[PDB]
Amino acid sequence: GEADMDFLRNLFSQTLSLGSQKERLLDELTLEGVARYMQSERCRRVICLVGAGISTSAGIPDFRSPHLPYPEAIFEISYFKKHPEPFFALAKELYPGQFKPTICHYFMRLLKDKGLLLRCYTQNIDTLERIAGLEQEDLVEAHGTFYTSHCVSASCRHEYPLSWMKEKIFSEVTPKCEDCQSLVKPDIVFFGESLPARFFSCMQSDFLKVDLLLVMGTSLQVQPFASLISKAPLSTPRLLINKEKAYRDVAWLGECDQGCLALAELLGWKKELEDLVRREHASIDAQS
Ligand SMILES: NC(=O)c1ccccc1Nc1cccc(OCCc2ccccc2)c1
Ligand SMILES: [Zn+2]
């Protein structure tokens, strides 16, 4: 009761000092304020921007981590169209023994299920967002993905699923297009290739009406998202969940999974989320 009054005193004092130009929508710069903000009528659109940190607990590191000219050519598109073998050998070595999304991936599934997710911008090619159930339209796979692959020939472009590529990779035979006999390349954005065009219209408009940015497993100031993030309105709250003046920023520094759990609990979804995760994990265990 005196705490409720103190809560108002702090809110009034922090907004008074902010001053004249900036607008603060969070009633408190905490995970709690963010939960209340996302449970309010103002929060209709949420965009998640995620990186590697949300996959560490699922055991899949970024693959760029540590006769071929320089080490990097294995990541270059033109070197790939001429010498595909090195890449596919590495792809075999690094192929994940499992695809089990994390609590954080499923938290995003809840956002989508509750009609709250405008889009999930990801730097991961690991495919977990799709396994957790996010669809093509909910995503902008910025470094591309190994989920699908295509024939390199412009007048063919035959698509192939992971099933088909996995088999090739472990058999150590170079994937060829059944129709045009041309190479079949994973839809990863190789060095030299570019982010596909339709994603630009997302970037150019999604950030205009976003009500909340959830940045997880990657940092706020690092390019390239930093530039995507800077297109959001200045009043747009941003919650950062990553391992290691302010009026519209809140930070949860710790493991991405524990963070999504604390937020889900504050929203009363903890149980529903832990149920989704147990279920899918068993449902994935029974496929293989
Ligand atoms: N962003 C990247 O990691 C990347 C960028 C350009 C070129 C290659 C890249 N990744 C890469 C390069 C070599 C092998 C590899 O591992 C592939 C295994 C895999 C990928 C995605 C899903 C499941 C398995 C990934
Ligand atoms: Zn083809």
Residue numbers in the entry: 34 to 99, 111 to 288, 313 to 356
Relevant lines from the article:
Sirtuin 2 (SIRT2), a member of the NAD+-dependent histone deacetylase family, has recently received increasing attention due to its potential involvement in neurodegenerative diseases and the progression of cancer. Human sirtuins (SIRT1–7) are currently the only known class of histone deacetylases that require NAD+ to catalyze the selective deacetylation of lysine in histone and non-histone proteins. The catalytic region of sirtuins consists of a Rossmann-fold domain, a zinc-binding domain and the loops connecting them. The interface between the loops and the two domains form both NAD+ (subdivided by the pockets A–C) and Ac-Lys substrate-binding sites.
Herein, with the aim to elucidate the binding mode of this prototype and to further improve the inhibitory activity, we initially solved the single-crystal X-ray diffraction structure of SIRT2 in complex with 3′-phenethyloxy-2-anilinobenzamide, which revealed that 6 is located in the selectivity pocket. The inhibitor binds to a highly lipophilic pocket localized at the interface between the Rossmann-fold domain and a small domain adjacent to the C-pocket of the NAD+-binding site. The binding mode analysis of 6 revealed that its phenoxyethylphenyl moiety is surrounded by Phe131, Leu134, Leu138, Tyr139, Pro140, Phe143 and Ile169, which leads to the establishment of π–π and H–π interactions. The 2-aminobenzamide moiety oriented towards the acetyl–lysine tunnel exhibits hydrogen bonds with water molecules HOH3, HOH4 and HOH11. Of these three water molecules, HOH3 and HOH4 are stabilized by a hydrogen bond network with the side chain of the catalytically active His187 and the main chain of Val233, i.e., the key amino acid residues that stabilize the binding of the acetyl–lysine substrate during the deacetylation reaction. Closer evaluation of the superimposed SIRT2 structures revealed that the amide group of 6 might occupy the same space as the methyl group of the N ε-acetyl–lysine substrate. This result prompted us to take a new perspective toward targeting the substrate-binding site through the functionalization of the benzamide moiety in 6 to mimic the acetyl–lysine interactions, which afforded compounds 17–19, 26–28, 36, 41 and 42. In the field of SIRT2 inhibitor design, a milestone on the elucidation of the mechanism behind the isotype selectivity of SIRT2 inhibitors has recently been reported by Rumpf et al., who discovered that the novel drug-like small molecule SirReal2 (5)32,33 is able to induce a rearrangement of the SIRT2 active site by creating a binding pocket, called the “selectivity pocket”, which is responsible for isoform specificity, suggesting a potential common mode of action for selective SIRT2 inhibitors. In fact, the “selectivity pocket” is the pocket that accommodates the long chain fatty acyl groups. In this study, the binding mode of 6 on SIRT2 was elucidated using X-ray crystallography.
